[PDB]
């Protein structure tokens, strides 16, 4: 009855556990979880996890996101918005990490990860660690520092996983 017994994982803190795998697969195991999307300011879900989440939703995520942006305008870097879960999770928290390519302030990861504490169980990638160019260890450091809730941080690369878990 513990989904983590079926996954390669390491307990990091009493709050945070890191899992090697696919964040969408992990979130599907926890019906009351919130799944984080590593988004951009306009919720245009291209290429990384965001595109996978949109594909998993058969486009419904993008349609919702389109509507949201036209109603409310774009997010600022470091902001987040809770949107529907689309049967992937209870809800999807779209979080806008800093894009190092744009020279944005990496410390805005503090705000990103703080936004997760509103929810009792969160499944998240390492925000800003892919297309956005922030080192996985930097992103993980922020998460570890900020977490005050149950967080499953999920990494799809064994190489990233081992870089973060072997001490
Ligand atoms: N399904 C997944 N499960 C877990 N980890 C994942 C998954 N897919 C990607 N990753 C990893 O999650 C981290 C976050 O990577 P990105 O998705 O590229 O996120 P980010 O760097 O915040 O870039 C966001 C930007 O990319 C676009 O998808 C998004 O529209 C935005 O423009 C990276 O280490 C990436 O390899």
CATH for 97: 3.40.220.10
How far, in Å, from the CA of 129 to the mean position of ligand 1?
7
Question: What is the distance between the alpha carbons of residues 97 and 133, in angstroms, rounded to a whole number?
Answer: 10
| β pairing state of 34-39 and 16-20 | unpaired
Residue 54 tokens, joined: 């949109």
Phi, psi at 11, each rounded to 5° = -75, 125
Question: What is the distance between the alpha carbons of residues 124 and 105, in angstroms, rounded to a whole number?
Answer: 20
- CB 110, CB 147: distance < 8 Å: no
Residue 44 tokens, joined: 């245009």
Which of ligand 1's atoms lies nearest the C-alpha of 134? 21
Closest CA to 56 of 23, 97, 96: 23
Domain holding 72, by residue range, is 1-167
Is the beta carbon of 128 within 6 A of some atom in ligand 1? yes
Kindly report the protein residue whose alpha carbon is nearest to atom 1 of ligand 1.
Answer: 22
The number of domains in the chain is 1
Q: What is the DSSP string of 110-125?
A: HHHHHGGGGSSEEEE-
- CB 91, CB 84: distance < 8 Å: yes
Is the beta carbon of 164 within 6 A of some atom in ligand 1? no
- List, in sequence order, every residue forming a beta bridge with 151; answer none if it has no partner: 16, 122
- Give the DSSP H or E segment for 151: strand 150-155
Question: What is the distance between the alpha carbons of residues 9 and 37, in angstroms, rounded to a whole number?
Answer: 20
The side-by-side arrangement of strands in the sheet containing 9-11 is 9-11, 16-20, 150-155, 121-124, 34-39, 91-96, 80-84
Closest CA to 132 of 67, 11, 49: 49
Experimental method: X-ray
């Amino acid at each position: 009855m513990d989904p983590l017994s079926n996954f390669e994982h390491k307990v990091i803190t009493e709050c945070v556990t890191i899992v090697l795998g696919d964040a969408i697969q992990v979130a599907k195991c926890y019906g009351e979880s919130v799944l984080v999307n590593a988004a951009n300011t306009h919720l245009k879900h291209g290429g990384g996890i965001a595109g996978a989440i949109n594909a998993a939703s058969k486009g419904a995520v993008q349609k919702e996101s389109d509507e949201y942006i036209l109603a409310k305008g774009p997010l600022q870097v470091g902001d987040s918005v809770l949107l529907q879960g689309h049967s992937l999770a209870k809800n999807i928290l779209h979080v806008v990490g800093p894009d190092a390519r744009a020279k944005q302030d990496v410390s805005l990861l503090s705000k990103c990860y703080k936004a997760m504490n509103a929810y009792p169980l969160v499944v998240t990638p390492l925000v800003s660690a892919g297309i956005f160019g922030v080192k996985p260890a930097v992103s993980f450091d922020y998460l570890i520092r900020e977490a005050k809730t149950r967080v499953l941080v999920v990494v799809n690369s064994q190489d990233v996983y081992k870089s973060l878990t072997i001490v």
